[PDB]
From a paper:
Domain 4 has no known function but contains the CTP, which is folded as 2 anti-parallel β-strands connected by a short α-helix.
Residue His-132 is required for heptamer formation. Our MD-based observations thus suggest that the CTP remains bound to aerolysin upon proteolytic activation of the protoxin.
Residue numbers in the entry: 2 to 423, 441 to 467
Write the structure that this text describes.
């Protein structure tokens, strides 16, 4: 009877008020799933719990403490019971696409048996080979065009009505979504921030009046370039759902964008030039000078990389449905030949979503395909739970290669304390030498703030 975080809903209806069919989450309940709630809150959010308590956002370290709030964390007065657990990922090593697929479809404990049992619990007939009396055993895995077919070996004769008609499980339409946030990196091959030049001098206030309200601005443009390799050919088909910026590693500042819906293997490098300007608005007492410095740096970095790409596929179950026991909502008794496609991965529509069908099973108007309550009655709640959690187990392929980047950047303009003379700039800049160091169109200017 745990509290299910994915059933929580926030209401903004006044002190301790919840919407219809919801009730306020109490402190014990909130504690039991604390990190999940906090992880659904804004940094400085503070939300009400029942009986004078409040739970705070991650900026407050997700504290539960007494208080009042106009918004309230709430939970179904009648929650959907026995959710399908989420299991830890199944990690498959980087490889070419065939070898990655092969590794998946030939896994007995993680793929063959779970999908077989699923076909079996749904009412599909003869999910098993002739040389075993158990479901999902003596299965034949064969390549079929761009996909794969799992199906009980059928050699020879067999005993049972229509035992020759073995149910087939076909895996197709593989896709691979790189998860930017799964980023991990090996040991930093090359790394350093080297000082290539320091621009140094003075800014002088010649007047007899404390001068201020004057900006001293350095403008310059530099190039950042980066490259990367892709260890294997799978990367030729992996994409990322949304554009993202390359992770920051080291102090070497970098601006690199990976494009959405573009072959990982097609984004192997680039160079960007950007005009940047930084300034300071110093107060310089009358008839004085202040020292000014600007450090210029070259930075580069190399390191082996690895992301995870979430592997999704369609599971098409085809075979005839057993008499006096199948899970189709009509419960057909004529042994019809049946075909159904589940999408293992990102949701596509209700008909093809085990998770959706499952969570809605107690709503008769939603039961338009499989009758999961029947599967539960026949095999038991935890049996259906453990099987589907294995069927739906996230599968992730590793995406590897080497990364390398190079940039040139200026440090901040730094100033020292005023010295009495014994806004005018005395700060030599050699355009040619700077250009040779990768800093172009460099200027230092004095203008009203």
């Amino acid at each position: 009877e745990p509290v299910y975080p994915d059933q929580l809903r926030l209401f903004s209806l006044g002190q301790g008020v919840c919407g219809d069919k919801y009730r306020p989450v109490n402190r014990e309940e909130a504690q039991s799933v604390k990190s999940n709630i906090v992880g659904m809150m804004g940094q400085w959010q503070i939300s009400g719990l029942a009986n004078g308590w409040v739970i705070m956002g991650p900026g407050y370290n997700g504290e539960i403490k007494p208080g009042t709030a106009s918004n309230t964390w709430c939970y179904p007065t009648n929650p959907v019971t026995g959710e399908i657990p989420t299991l830890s990922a199944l990690d498959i090593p980087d490889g070419d696409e065939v070898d990655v697929q092969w590794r998946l479809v030939h896994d007995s404990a993680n793929f063959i048996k779970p999908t077989s049992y699923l076909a079996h619990y749904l009412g599909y007939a003869w999910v098993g080979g002739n040389d075993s009396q158990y479901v999902g055993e003596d299965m034949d895995v064969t390549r079929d065009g761009d996909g794969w077919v799992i199906r009980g070996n059928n050699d020879g004769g067999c005993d049972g009505y229509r035992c020759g008609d073995k149910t087939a499980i076909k895996v197709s339409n593989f896709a691979y979504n790189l998860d930017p946030d799964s980023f991990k990196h090996g040991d930093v091959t090359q790394s350093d921030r080297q000082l290539v030049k320091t621009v140094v001098g003075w800014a002088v206030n010649d007047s007899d009046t404390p001068q201020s309200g004057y900006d001293v601005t350095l403008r310059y443009d530099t190039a950042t370039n980066w490259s990367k390799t892709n260890t294997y050919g799978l990367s030729e088909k992996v994409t990322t759902k949304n554009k993202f910026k390359w992770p920051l590693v080291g102090e070497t500042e970098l601006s690199i964008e990976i494009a959405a819906n573009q072959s990982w293997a097609s984004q192997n490098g680039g160079s960007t030039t950007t005009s940047l300007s930084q300034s300071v608005r110093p107060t310089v007492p009358a008839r004085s000078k202040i020292p000014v410095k600007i450090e210029l740096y070259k930075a580069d970095i190399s390191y082996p990389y690895e992301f995870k790409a979430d592997v999704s596929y369609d599971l098409t179950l085809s075979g005839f449905l057993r008499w006096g026991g199948n899970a189709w909502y009509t419960h057909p008794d004529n042994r019809p030949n049946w075909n159904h496609t589940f999408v293992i991965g990102p949701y596509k529509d209700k008909a093809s979503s085990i998770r959706y069908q499952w969570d809605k099973r107690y709503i008769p108007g939603e039961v338009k395909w499989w009758d999961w309550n029947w599967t539960i009655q026949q095999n038991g709640l935890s049996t259906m739970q453990n099987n589907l959690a294995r069927v739906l187990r996230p599968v992730r392929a590793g995406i590897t290669g080497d990364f390398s980047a190079e940039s040139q950047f200026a440090g901040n303009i730094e100033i020292g304390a005023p010295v009495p003379l014994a806004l005018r700039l005395e700060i030599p800049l050699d355009a040619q030498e700077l250009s040779g160091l990768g800093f172009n169109n460099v200027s230092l200017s004095v203008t009203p703030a």
